[PDB]
Design a protein around this nucleic acid. Structure first.
Ligand SMILES: NC[C@@H]1O[C@H](O[C@H]2[C@@H](O)[C@H](O[C@@H]3[C@@H](O)[C@H](N)C[C@H](N)[C@H]3O[C@H]3O[C@H](CO)[C@@H](O)[C@H](O)[C@H]3N)O[C@@H]2CO)[C@H](N)[C@@H](O)[C@@H]1O
Ligand SMILES: NC[C@@H]1O[C@H](O[C@H]2[C@@H](O)[C@H](O[C@@H]3[C@@H](O)[C@H](N)C[C@H](N)[C@H]3O[C@H]3O[C@H](CO)[C@@H](O)[C@H](O)[C@H]3N)O[C@@H]2CO)[C@H](N)[C@@H](O)[C@@H]1O
Ligand SMILES: [Mg+2]
Ligand SMILES: [Mg+2]
Ligand SMILES: [Mg+2]
Ligand SMILES: [Mg+2]
Ligand SMILES: [Mg+2]
Ligand SMILES: [Mg+2]
Ligand SMILES: [Mg+2]
Ligand SMILES: [Mg+2]
Ligand SMILES: [Mg+2]
Ligand SMILES: [Mg+2]
Ligand SMILES: [Mg+2]
Ligand SMILES: [Mg+2]
Ligand SMILES: [Mg+2]
Ligand SMILES: [Mg+2]
Ligand SMILES: [Mg+2]
Ligand SMILES: [Mg+2]
Ligand SMILES: [Mg+2]
Ligand SMILES: [Mg+2]
Ligand SMILES: [Mg+2]
Ligand SMILES: [Mg+2]
Ligand SMILES: [Mg+2]
Ligand SMILES: [Mg+2]
Ligand SMILES: [Mg+2]
Ligand SMILES: [Mg+2]
Ligand SMILES: [Mg+2]
Ligand SMILES: [Mg+2]
Ligand SMILES: [Mg+2]
Ligand SMILES: [Mg+2]
Ligand SMILES: [Mg+2]
Ligand SMILES: [Mg+2]
Ligand SMILES: [Mg+2]
Ligand SMILES: [Mg+2]
Ligand SMILES: [Mg+2]
Ligand SMILES: [Mg+2]
Ligand SMILES: [Mg+2]
Ligand SMILES: [Mg+2]
Ligand SMILES: [Mg+2]
Ligand SMILES: [Mg+2]
Ligand SMILES: [Mg+2]
Ligand SMILES: [Mg+2]
Ligand SMILES: [Mg+2]
Ligand SMILES: [Mg+2]
Ligand SMILES: [Mg+2]
Ligand SMILES: [Mg+2]
Ligand SMILES: [Mg+2]
Ligand SMILES: [Mg+2]
Ligand SMILES: [Mg+2]
Ligand SMILES: [Mg+2]
Ligand SMILES: [Zn+2]
Ligand SMILES: [Zn+2]
Lengths: 91, 128, 216, 100, 97, 198, 25
RNA sequence: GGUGAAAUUCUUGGAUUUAUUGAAGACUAACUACUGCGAAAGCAUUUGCCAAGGACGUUUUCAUUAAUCAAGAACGAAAGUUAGGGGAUCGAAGAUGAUCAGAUACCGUCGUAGUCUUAACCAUAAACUAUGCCGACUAGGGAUCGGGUGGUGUUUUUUUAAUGACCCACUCGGCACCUUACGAGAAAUCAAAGUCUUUGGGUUCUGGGGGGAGUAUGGUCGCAAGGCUGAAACUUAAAGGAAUUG
């Protein structure tokens, strides 16, 4: 029961739109649909809806996220520089 | 002792020589003259006689501003660059004795990275 | 045609009193007239003189010290301790092949609330009857050595302020505790304090600034 | 050379008795049968302080785990995850005196 | 056919040495290769040392030195004759001149 | 709706009366329901907090930042945007900051901004993929879509609208001093064509 | 001609030969 | 600024040079060696964590469980590919300035992709020691890395006794090196490239004149660039290796 080979989730799109576009969608499509780790309750309950917001299906806490994934990579590289330049000012 | 003091920072490129005198904290400069002034070449901007003809015209204002004695600071281009002093740099330091300015406390400021950025010229080299 | 130097007001430079010779030389500044006076770019300046010139004993010849101007008082400017370099020639002259070069530092804040990270440099030597051509140290030596190099580098900068270490490094008190400590591991020629870098500073207060100046 | 924690916990795991989780730990706290409690780093400060106050009452040593409840549950060698651990007997391990 | 048993210069049991840039060509070359002659100079040289020690303060003073280690690629090092060509058995000798 | 940058609703207690006062903030990516937002010059440096700009060290990144004090925010409101403080001033309460467009602008150190970079992530990476996906995009925004090409209209409808082939026929770069009704195409255009400028 | 450049030369030949054969659908 | 000389370009909106403070990205100097580690590719700032590996020590344990391998699999420099992050430097394409009979270049200024990272591909390098793995056997010599054993050897303190470092002798296990040819080879050379017409310890892979040609075709893998597999017709007396003298 292997079903598709390449497309997977984007088999829904059939022959339409072109490979690269269809292919680029699958990436983010899988990101946004994935379940993530609650930094609070500690389960993989974090799901999306309404891009930018992410909640826990059990502990009911909602985190402002990236659009299609929970951590903007550039935004974690922010939290660092924020934490860094804070620890310089308070030390 | 007396000897009103200044800091004479000499930078010798293979293509030119910098002779620069300031006060102790490096802010206010006294006079700076280089080989590209005292000759018409583009070849001789680094000339040993150039950099010697430089310290000369410095010294007239050095005693005139009131810097009687001067430290000495020498560097090549450094960083990713040649690191080896130019031709006129040593014919400058000496020509500072033709002034009457009193030298002291020599030291070398050539910038020497901790293993820096990639070098110019591209691998297979500079080929001629 | 113009000449900036007409109008140039000359100033006298006062070192800290944790040193010996306090007369550095005559710095100059542009005049104090209206629109941006001459206490503006005087105050913040940073000077570097040789420790042989400060203490008068030339035994210190290879140690440069950064001296930060803090206050300007009555045509007489006052400074404090900023940083300490090793110059170049000496530092490179201590680097010889066929031996281990050790480096260390640690960040430590002092009691006067100066956050500091101060560097140490060591080496290793043949001892006496050694026929072994090179001096190299085992890595599991260089580890705990550099550790206690910093553990000693901590407790000295930590317990006291900057005014004490300004006079602690002059005799090289710290270096001797490193040869006293690391005697038991490897021979270790040429222990020093190569650089101290002044990161965080308090502000003004002129009670540690005048615990310095006015006496010399 | 150093036992970290989880070695000490692995010995606690099969030597003497223990219980796992908020409810059961409160029992042990209310019975004074608890020598130590370990609290996972991600447990909510409400439970953290409710456990801290419960514990200081009966005077039980308190330790804050460095990991979340996910790694702590595997630190007791259990397959599920646990937010707080109560040590009913040290058995053949220490943890009670040493370095904590 | 093999000219040398160091082949250009010594590796002998490693896979790589992070190559170094030439101080003349900028030509790249492995650190295990690449002729390196440490060069220390007097800060003054010439007859400068005389009237310089004259012109200075401090008693008698002392003279600093510039410290540079230059790395050379073959093509440059041979042209600039840091190193020359030797004979079949002359090349063999590794003793420094 | 029609905003791709989630909103965070922050309650506050009214200083001068006993009531609750709700605020609408743009969530900063890592702001989360239940967290405590701190607001003022004495406030700490943490994601979600709003601070004066001179009150942060340079290098600090911030969003929803006011162009002048107390206008309640302008710059970097969009999903995924931030502005970095590049320096401060002793004189006249000035910071200086680099805006997302890249141009640096010098504003008042008393002006505010919230610590972080707005949520909503990489939203524009995902291809629209369909006409309908762009249809609902603008159904909730404004009706600019779809767009009929001026070169496709008749001369009455657009300067481009000259026909018999499809071509613009005169320079597609219009002046700045041009008049309303002549301005279509590349408007102030400094230069034109493919750049590749990193 | 250089070994390497004979390689690049036929690597271009095989591309053009694939392309002409492609017109046979 | 820049070269052999120049020009390009930067500049009295103060250029290069000077100082104070700040930002981003790379890199990890000197130490650095015919020294280390890893299956290779490779790996070079400090501390912590997570697991790993050799050699050694051993009067533990198991007791043939092993050796080498078609298939199949893990990893695999660099460039390169798809996406975001990044973008300091260097820098294909390119743009130029010079150079030459020409100069699509070498040299000079700028500079796109690249270079950096994350996720995913790609699976090629003179990926070289151009030298399969296991086991035995045959020769002297000093340096050295790690471990162990013996030194009533040595040096620094306050038992000048104690953990160290140094010296010396022995012994495994390493990265190399030197001399000799015992042998071997076409030679260059080689402690293996010896123990080969006195031709067999075990085992894996490849080659069979030069071309044509790594071409054509089929298959297969890849997003693609490409990789893997891989002919024949026909053509030709040389091609080639090492060494010698010119
Ligand atoms: N898909 C995510 C990213 O989108 C951007 O790519 C898009 C833009 O960069 C580019 O320009 C589009 C313009 O065509 C379109 N008609 C309007 C859009 N605002 C523009 O974007 C442009 O302007 C915005 C501000 O408006 C700038 O912030 C941005 O830097 C600039 N590229 O058009 C691209 C799409 O056709 C990133 N540049 C690209 O690297 C990446 O694909
Ligand atoms: N696998 C190493 C073997 O060492 C053997 O023995 C060597 C050494 O083990 C032995 O010891 C020598 C000593 O003789 C000589 N007079 C002084 C030398 N330092 C010693 O070497 C010793 O110290 C050095 C460091 O100094 C260490 O690197 C080495 O491991 C150690 N054995 O001396 C030999 C060298 O002259 C044989 N040379 C040979 O079988 C092989 O090389
Ligand atoms: Mg934080
Ligand atoms: Mg020149
Ligand atoms: Mg000129
Ligand atoms: Mg001129
Ligand atoms: Mg040549
Ligand atoms: Mg131990
Ligand atoms: Mg053990
Ligand atoms: Mg709770
Ligand atoms: Mg090599
Ligand atoms: Mg290699
Ligand atoms: Mg419509
Ligand atoms: Mg359109
Ligand atoms: Mg249209
Ligand atoms: Mg029409
Ligand atoms: Mg019209
Ligand atoms: Mg028209
Ligand atoms: Mg028409
Ligand atoms: Mg028509
Ligand atoms: Mg058309
Ligand atoms: Mg058209
Ligand atoms: Mg018109
Ligand atoms: Mg080949
Ligand atoms: Mg067909
Ligand atoms: Mg000309
Ligand atoms: Mg200037
Ligand atoms: Mg280093
Ligand atoms: Mg196989
Ligand atoms: Mg690669
Ligand atoms: Mg690449
Ligand atoms: Mg492409
Ligand atoms: Mg960017
Ligand atoms: Mg460049
Ligand atoms: Mg070109
Ligand atoms: Mg002609
Ligand atoms: Mg001709
Ligand atoms: Mg032409
Ligand atoms: Mg012509
Ligand atoms: Mg070029
Ligand atoms: Mg592109
Ligand atoms: Mg191959
Ligand atoms: Mg090789
Ligand atoms: Mg091969
Ligand atoms: Mg040993
Ligand atoms: Mg026979
Ligand atoms: Mg054949
Ligand atoms: Mg092929
Ligand atoms: Mg094929
Ligand atoms: Mg031949
Ligand atoms: Zn949760
Ligand atoms: Zn070169």
């Amino acid at each position: 029961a292997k079903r598709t080979k390449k497309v997977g989730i984007t088999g829904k799109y059939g022959v339409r739109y072109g490979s690269s576009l269809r292919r680029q969608v699958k990436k983010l499509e899988i990101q946004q649909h994935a379940r993530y780790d609650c930094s609070f309750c500690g389960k993989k309950t974090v799901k999306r809806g309404a891009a930018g917001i992410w909640t826990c299906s059990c502990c009911k806490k909602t985190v402002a996220g990236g659009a299609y994934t929970v951590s903007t990579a550039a935004a974690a590289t922010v939290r660092s520089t924020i934490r860094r330049l804070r620890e310089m000012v308070e030390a | 002792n007396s000897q009103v003091f200044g800091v004479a920072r000499i930078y010798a490129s293979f293509n030119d020589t910098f002779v620069h005198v300031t006060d102790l904290s490096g802010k206010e400069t006294i006079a700076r003259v280089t080989g590209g002034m005292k000759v018409k070449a583009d070849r001789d901007e680094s000339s040993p006689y150039a950099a010697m003809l430089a310290a000369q015209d410095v010294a007239a204002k050095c005693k005139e501003v009131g810097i009687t004695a001067v430290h000495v600071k020498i560097r090549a281009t450094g960083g990713t660059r040649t690191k080896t002093p130019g031709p006129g740099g040593q014919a400058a330091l000496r020509a500072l004795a033709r002034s009457g300015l009193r030298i002291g406390r020599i030291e070398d400021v050539t910038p020497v990275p901790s293993d820096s950025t990639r070098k110019k010229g591209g691998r297979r080299g500079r080929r001629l | 045609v113009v000449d900036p130097f007409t109008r140039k007001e000359w100033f006298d430079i006062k070192a800290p009193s944790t040193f010996e010779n306090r007369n550095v030389g005559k710095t100059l500044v542009n005049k104090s007239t209206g629109l941006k006076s001459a206490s503006d770019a005087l105050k913040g300046r940073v000077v570097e003189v040789c420790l042989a010139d400060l203490q008068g004993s030339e035994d210190h010849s290879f140690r440069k010290i950064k001296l930060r101007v803090d206050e300007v008082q009555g045509k007489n400017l006052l400074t404090n301790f900023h940083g300490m370099d090793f110059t170049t020639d000496k530092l490179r002259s201590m680097v010889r092949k066929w031996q281990t070069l050790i480096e260390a530092n640690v960040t430590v804040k002092t009691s006067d609330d100066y956050v500091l990270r101060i560097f140490a440099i060591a080496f290793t030597r043949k001892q006496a009857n050694q026929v072994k051509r090179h001096s190299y140290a085992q890595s599991s030596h260089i580890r705990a050595i550099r550790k206690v190099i910093s553990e000693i580098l901590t407790k000295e900068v930590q317990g006291s302020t900057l005014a004490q270490l300004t006079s602690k490094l002059i005799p090289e008190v710290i270096n001797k505790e490193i040869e006293n400590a690391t005697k038991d591991i490897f021979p270790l020629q040429n222990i020093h304090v190569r650089k101290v870098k002044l990161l965080k500073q308090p502000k003004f207060d002129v009670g540690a600034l005048m615990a310095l100046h006015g006496e010399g | 050379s150093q036992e970290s924690i989880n070695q000490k916990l692995a010995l606690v795991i099969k030597s003497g008795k223990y219980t796992l989780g908020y409810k059961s730990t409160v029992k042990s706290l209310r019975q004074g049968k608890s020598k130590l409690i370990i609290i996972a780093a991600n447990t909510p400060v409400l439970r953290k302080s409710e456990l801290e106050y419960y514990a200081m009452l009966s005077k039980t040593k308190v330790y804050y785990f460095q990991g979340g409840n996910n790694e702590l549950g595997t630190a007791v060698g259990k397959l599920f995850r646990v937010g707080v651990v109560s040590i009913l007997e040290a058995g053949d391990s220490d943890i009670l005196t040493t370095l904590a | 056919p093999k000219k040398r048993a160091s082949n250009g210069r010594n590796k002998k049991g490693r896979g790589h040495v992070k190559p170094v840039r030439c101080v003349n060509c900028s030509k790249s070359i492995p650190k295990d290769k690449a002729i390196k002659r440490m060069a220390i100079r007097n800060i003054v040289e010439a007859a400068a040392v005389r009237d310089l020690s004259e012109a200075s303060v401090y008693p008698e003073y002392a003279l600093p030195k510039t410290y540079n280690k230059l790395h050379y690629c073959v093509s440059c090092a041979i042209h600039a004759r840091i190193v020359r060509v030797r004979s079949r058995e002359d090349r063999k000798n590794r003793a420094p001149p | 709706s029609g905003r791709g940058a989630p909103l965070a609703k922050v309650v506050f207690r009214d200083p001068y009366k006993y009531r609750l006062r709700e605020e609408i903030f743009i969530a900063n990516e890592g702001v989360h329901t239940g967290q405590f937002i701190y607001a003022g010059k004495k406030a700490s440096l943490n994601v979600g907090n709003v601070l004066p700009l001179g009150s942060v060290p340079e290098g600090t990144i911030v969003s929803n930042v006011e162009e002048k004090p107390g206008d309640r925010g302008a710059l970097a409101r969009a999903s995924g945007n931030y502005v970095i403080i590049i320096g401060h001033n002793p004189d006249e309460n000035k910071t200086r900051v680099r805006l997302p467009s890249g141009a640096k602008k010098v504003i008042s150190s008393d002006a505010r901004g919230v610590i972080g970079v707005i949520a909503g992530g990489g939203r524009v990476d995902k291809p629209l993929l369909k006409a309908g996906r762009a249809f609902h995009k603008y159904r909730l925004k404004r009706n600019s879509w779809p767009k009929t090409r001026g070169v496709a209209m008749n001369p009455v409808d657009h300067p481009h609208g000259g026909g018999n082939h499809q071509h613009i026929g005169k320079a597609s770069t219009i002046s700045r001093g041009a008049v309303s009704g002549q301005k279509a195409g590349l408007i102030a255009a400094r230069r034109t064509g493919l750049l590749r400028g990193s | 001609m250089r070994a390497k450049w004979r390689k690049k030369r036929t690597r271009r030949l095989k591309r053009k030969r694939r392309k002409v054969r492609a017109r046979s659908k």
